[PDB]
Amino acid sequence: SEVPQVVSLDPTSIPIEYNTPIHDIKVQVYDIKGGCNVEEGLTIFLVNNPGKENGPVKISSKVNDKQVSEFLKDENMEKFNVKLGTSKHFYMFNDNKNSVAVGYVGCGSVADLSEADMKRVVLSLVTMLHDNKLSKLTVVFEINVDKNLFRFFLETLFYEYMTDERFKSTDKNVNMEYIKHLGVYINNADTYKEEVEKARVYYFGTYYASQLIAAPSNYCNPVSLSNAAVELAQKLNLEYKILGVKELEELKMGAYLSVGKGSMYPNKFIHLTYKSKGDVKKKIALVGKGITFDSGGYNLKAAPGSMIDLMKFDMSGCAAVLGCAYCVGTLKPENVEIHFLSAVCENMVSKNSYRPGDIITASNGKTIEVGNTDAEGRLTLADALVYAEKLGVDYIVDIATLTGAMLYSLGTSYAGVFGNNEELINKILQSSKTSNEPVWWLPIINEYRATLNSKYADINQISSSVKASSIVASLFLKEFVQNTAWAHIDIAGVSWNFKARKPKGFGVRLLTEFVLND
Amino acid sequence: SEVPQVVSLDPTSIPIEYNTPIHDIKVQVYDIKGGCNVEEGLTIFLVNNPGKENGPVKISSKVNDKQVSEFLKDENMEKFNVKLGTSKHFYMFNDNKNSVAVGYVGCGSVADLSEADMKRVVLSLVTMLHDNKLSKLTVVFEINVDKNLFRFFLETLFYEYMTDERFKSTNMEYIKHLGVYINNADTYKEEVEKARVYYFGTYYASQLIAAPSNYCNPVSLSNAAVELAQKLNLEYKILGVKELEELKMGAYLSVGKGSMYPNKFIHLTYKSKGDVKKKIALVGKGITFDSGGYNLKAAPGSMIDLMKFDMSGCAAVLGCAYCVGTLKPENVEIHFLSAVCENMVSKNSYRPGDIITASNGKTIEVGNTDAEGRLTLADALVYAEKLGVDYIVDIATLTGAMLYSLGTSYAGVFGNNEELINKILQSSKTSNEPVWWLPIINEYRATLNSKYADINQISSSVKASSIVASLFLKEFVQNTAWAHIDIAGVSWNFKARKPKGFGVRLLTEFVLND
Amino acid sequence: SEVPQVVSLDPTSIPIEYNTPIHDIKVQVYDIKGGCNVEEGLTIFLVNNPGKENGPVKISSKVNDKQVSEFLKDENMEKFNVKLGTSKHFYMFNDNKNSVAVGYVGCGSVADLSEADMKRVVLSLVTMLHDNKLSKLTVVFEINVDKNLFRFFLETLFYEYMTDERFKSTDKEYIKHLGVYINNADTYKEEVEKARVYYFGTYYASQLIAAPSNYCNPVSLSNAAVELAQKLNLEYKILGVKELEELKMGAYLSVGKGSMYPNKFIHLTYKSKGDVKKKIALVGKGITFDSGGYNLKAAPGSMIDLMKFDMSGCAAVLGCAYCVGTLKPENVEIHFLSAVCENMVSKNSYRPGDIITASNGKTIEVGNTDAEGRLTLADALVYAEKLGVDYIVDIATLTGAMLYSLGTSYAGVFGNNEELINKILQSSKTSNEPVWWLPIINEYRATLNSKYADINQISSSVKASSIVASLFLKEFVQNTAWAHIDIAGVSWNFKARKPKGFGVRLLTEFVL
Amino acid sequence: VNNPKENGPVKISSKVNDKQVSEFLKDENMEKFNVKLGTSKHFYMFNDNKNSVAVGYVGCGSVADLSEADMKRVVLSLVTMLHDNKLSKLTVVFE
Ligand SMILES: Nc1ccc(C(=O)N[C@@H](C(=O)NO)c2ccc(-n3cccn3)cc2)cc1
Ligand SMILES: Nc1ccc(C(=O)N[C@@H](C(=O)NO)c2ccc(-n3cccn3)cc2)cc1
Ligand SMILES: Nc1ccc(C(=O)N[C@@H](C(=O)NO)c2ccc(-n3cccn3)cc2)cc1
Ligand SMILES: [Zn+2]
Ligand SMILES: [Zn+2]
Ligand SMILES: [Zn+2]
Ligand SMILES: [Zn+2]
Ligand SMILES: [Zn+2]
Ligand SMILES: [Zn+2]
């Protein structure tokens, strides 16, 4: 529980902001049919023009104000177009003679708006919120979006609006003033109202996971992260248990322990549990990769493009699980038992570090020849999957920044999912669709399995020949699940937003939807 | 057209073996429910042991021979195990006193054998043949295979058995009879002659791919297509530089600029002898050699010595053309396309940064001359859609990124139509040439937005080169069903140091089963 | 104070030779207006020939010897030329009939000789000293040199003549007298002992730099500074980890985290005895060894075996402390600062991506553990400005890019004050340690803008790292004249396989 | 506009010969925007004539004597508004 220090200035806990300015925002949903009120703050219309590519702006919604309605006519709006991402700001006086702010965001020419498109819409909106000291934002939906897409709008709005300033001292912002009220005008409002607080919950679950990932490795270490996980479970009322080295030694988790050997921070295995109240019908184990930092070990990340400075994100799998625990813990689904697992450790270079060629013994008795100390993620997950299967669970779903090859496979937008079961994979894909976190199905090719045949150990950690590292890794993971439905989500490519220089908190909504939609 | 020479010793044609020793093999299929006759040749049993991993060998089938039956009892065969690929064969005299050879090949503990599993068995079997001077091989199937897997067995057996000696010189003779004992033999008989056809289509493509680039050039390869079309009776037309200039195929022509061999656009055609109901265009990448151009393949692992294989897509199309021309399917019109050229380093070569104009008017900013395949395919796809077809399917060793994606076993398929892709995937299953569906992610498309040209050839940032290339290709098909099969990883058999002839059976099953 | 050991054979102190064979050399300066006596030893004439490139040698000086004068006539000397660096030895009997050795060194055809020219002159002369068991060296200046260049001749003569054998278990006759014949001898005499002082300050810096990282560590080096301050008479204080924690020097401490050697902040002080009118703080980068950390110097050309030199800035300041401590200037107060530590790979090491907090409250996102010098200099600079000084000047082997900028001969100087830079440049001319002024380009500053911390350690795009580093440093000086001398390129003499001791004379001329 | 402090509020010094825009360019209204170098906002409104006018600002930082890299950032910020606007006339006021 106590975080070890080298100097007295070393942080002993990960700073966590629970009460975000977003949670202070009062969200009200009105039916657009009853007319719009252009009173205080900024009012933004989400407008499209089907068919006409980059067509003119036409405000369909009825506005309950003669001066604002006259301003927003068609003859005045024709000079602006609905190009996706386009925004405009308006200044005018209403019937009361008050300075009001009005504008719009282009939502393109396509009806059924996409998901990447919506993010561009949201980002465009956030630009209008930034550098402007508003108190209320009013969004008018002159487009049709299903309940899932609507919730996604708020989730993304909250997340992109929110700025992480935990580590600013002298460069904090002077002009950061979040709105206090959010008005939403949409048709058939009563069906969308339920999605607001669902969106707010998903927001923080994602934002919580984002905060953990964003925190540097000196702040976020195996101990402080486990402490933060405990603190989260306590606030939610989840059963929690943190296993230390002695307990892990008795469980004979040789793969997991070997990775953490070179670290000054003791291994910490996180095990949170949510037990729905009543007739538990589904038992689920969520496993997340929890490497607080990945130096690569003696196979040091010294090669160009290894991006060692980024490897604080290597606990994103773990962060996704904890963010989910919040959403699950808050929303309180019924008829489900969920285990949130993460074998947390740090991959470092030391006299105590494990060496290339070292043969270790996993907790299931299988001996593993280490071919590369930088392939540690599959080593920790191996023991984690054994732990998970021992729980007697129905579904085992691991999520991990496992292979860099994912950048060459699916890239930065789509995550890859592997598995040994077609129904479990289909549920992940279905959860991917409704959670609005894109994932693509990749194959586990058994012909490659022969390249893992060790001369001395039971199985090789890595392949010498096959360069399909994403599939080979899955072949390795597949060996540590004997008779349980298992899916593997590789989020190495999608976890970090290279453009925004911040985490996505990817997986939180996907996993939560996976649990809820079951 | 005559192949140009630097010296008189430079070859002017690709040597091709049309009449292979495989074609001389008489195949006989018997039903296993009746006992085996072990008179002549070599007799091999395909045996497994479900449950018992690496279990002992048990010959279930009754053998009509007293001396061989003693050999095949349980007490002697138990000393052998069924580990996948393991084999043993002994030489002995039968009841009449003739020298026969008997043995087995291990087929593992899993029932439903895969194709890689089946391939390993065949390899094990072929090793015994490369060490055999006799006349007959008899294979006894004590394992379960559907009609497709059995046909795949023969296809693979024929393909692996055959040895390419065109470039050798300067210990065996091929068998003349093949005996097969399998259950429900009468249903599998139809697959025998189909397999032999699929065999040569693959092996033909292999010969083209295996042929060095000094032998196989844009001229000699185009000549070979003519030679193939003439033997089959396919409408053929080879477009030269002047016609390609008039068609304004600027991307395609720019790639071949640095080559001493003129560009040759291959257009073969199979028209059914009736009412064409589906019209299909098959486009194949035809780079006879890929040096990479001024973006030279000098980085480690660039494998420039391998880049004769860069015409494998074309080889697949030609191989398919063989099968289609031979099998003669009905109600279909098929166009076999390949923009053939050579990517070389010269004063005449095209440069990085060059902006070129494709035949559809779109300008392309070249970011890397080693990405020449998509440039040639760009014009090839434009040519295809003008043909007015229902399906356009390109196949090409396009991206090395496939090696990190699916590897050397599975090829990747992209497309703009889900039904066409499903037809390809269904075709992958029956041909047993494995393909996995990969996504065209439209979010990446913005990275192809050039500052000066209409579209970028490559992305500066996004390293998912396999998806970006597909995004590029998609720009040259406007309103036609199009699929893209990336076979860069699967085309060459690195362990065996030879081509796979990948795509031939995949594409042929696609046209036939459609 | 006590140096930690892994094995008992690990050294606990930097061997230092204070009394070099150079110091036992009795130096005599005579005015040439009166003739040279070719009595004993080797006598070498420094000769020029204006206009002709490699023209003949003509010895102008009067020699108080009939036979040597006849030998040194024009008809005999014409077969030799004055090509810059050329040397010749002569054998002859003098008037009393004693075997004396005489010769010359070519000084080219150009009047105002440069420094590379003079070094070649000095080096060529040293060659005659190394293969000869001589007892006396007499140098006659038949060329024109200002008082400053003359001192440099002696400086370079002393430094190159001297051989460092501290780490030899083998070995293998320094001269005891040095005679100098020059016109206006009475003005050059004052430069004689000044050169000897500048010499050792330089040679002192060389010894510290040349000393391997197992000998010269944060503790042993800090001990040497204490030892140095004591042999002088400077107020000294070495801050250890506990007080540095209370001063909250988080950037500096993070770099030393992975080391077996505790951080040691060197703070020597020279306070004049009168009305201190200028207060100066000299900060030196003090990395006793630079492994690069988790961003290990594993790439080809990283020259990791050289990274013992990464304390050259500190060695320069200490060398300055010696010269200043010896010459004792008036009306000046000088603080000699150096945040000494070791950048190593360990479980305790700081990681890439780590956010640390400097002593001025600014949070820093570490992008590369091999950019540790600016991290240590940041806290050192905050400490420096707290002293309330007029000038803050740091000197450091900070960026390897300097080899691509100015190379190995010229050092780069950056700053936020133009008058301070001109004084540094002015010192470069008189110290004869070449320095070129480089710009701090504010357009690059945006590349140091961190997403989470106050400021980034490194830039993502811009490869002008020497400038980027300077932009980082500028953030830790709020309202004080500050100059930064990047000596990564000039610190090591790659051809001679030894340190240059660069910066010592430059800084001393700046103070004095 | 600049604010000699750092990322401080926007204050329009210039007198505007328009009652409606002057109301917009008031201190109470421009205070919500800051002068960070390159930051910009433009609004659309009707003037006294009831014509659609577009008004805005570009932040020129807190330093007086603008550099050359500084001016480019200002210009780019200005150019972005031109590329996203079907305007006919651009008016730049140098405060
Ligand atoms: N021989 C091998 C095979 C696979 C790997 C591999 O997949 N490494 C992982 C890793 O570090 N696991 O702990 C990996 C490397 C880079 C990235 N990466 C993700 C964004 C950028 N880079 C992700 C995962 C390494 C070495
Ligand atoms: N900037 C880029 C982007 C993509 C590529 C690329 O995919 N290149 C292709 C190619 O050169 N096609 O002609 C490629 C590279 C490697 C391989 N390869 C296949 C088996 C081994 N290597 C195949 C194709 C090259 C440069
Ligand atoms: N991404 C970066 C950017 C700059 C540096 C850098 O400045 N490295 C310095 C250094 O060691 N700082 O502590 C550096 C590197 C090489 C040399 N070098 C000097 C003689 C030869 N090489 C000197 C300094 C390192 C990594
Ligand atoms: Zn790793
Ligand atoms: Zn990892
Ligand atoms: Zn290429
Ligand atoms: Zn190619
Ligand atoms: Zn360094
Ligand atoms: Zn350094």
Curated annotation (Swiss-Prot), chain C:
Binding site for Zn(2+) 2: 285, 290, 310, 372
Subcellular location: Cytoplasm
Spans through the membrane: none
Positions that bind Zn(2+) 3: 305, 307, 310
Record field: catalytic activity: Release of an N-terminal amino acid, Xaa-|-Yaa-, in which Xaa is preferably Leu, but may be other amino acids including Pro although not Arg or Lys, and Yaa may be Pro. Amino acid amides and methyl esters are also readily hydrolyzed, but rates on arylamides are exceedingly low; L-cysteinylglycine + H2O = L-cysteine + glycine
Pfam families registered for this protein in UniProt: Peptidase_M17
Resulting phenotype, residue 436 to A: Loss of catalytic activity and impairs oligomerization
Cofactors (names): Zn(2+)
UniProt site positions, description: Essential for hexamer stabilization: 297
Annotated Zn(2+) 1 binding sites: 290, 370, 372
GO BP annotation list: peptide catabolic process; proteolysis
Matches recorded under CDD domains: Peptidase_M17
EC number of the protein: 3.4.11.1, 3.4.13.-
Regulation: Oligomerization is required for catalytic activity and is metal-dependent. The type of metal that binds the 2 metal binding sites influences catalytic activity and substrate specificity. In vitro, activated by Co(2+), Mn(2+), Ni(2+), Mg(2+) and Zn(2+) with decreasing strength. Occupancy of the site 2 is essential and sufficient for activating the enzyme but occupation of the 2 sites is necessary for full catalytic activity. Inhibited by fungal metabolite bestatin. Inhibited by Phe-Naphthyl (PNAP).
Written domain comment of the UniProt record: The L13 loop movement regulates the transition between active and inactive conformations by repositioning Lys-297, which, in turn, mediates the rearrangement of the binuclear metal center.
Subunit (UniProt): Homohexamer composed of dimer of trimers. Both the identity and concentration of metal ions available dictate the extent to which oligomerization occurs; Mn(2+) and Co(2+) induces oligomerization, whereas Mg(2+) has no effect, and Zn(2+) causes irreversible protein aggregation in vitro.
Family listed: Belongs to the peptidase M17 family.
Protein name according to UniProt: Leucine aminopeptidase
Organism: Plasmodium falciparum (isolate 3D7)
Name of encoding gene: LAP
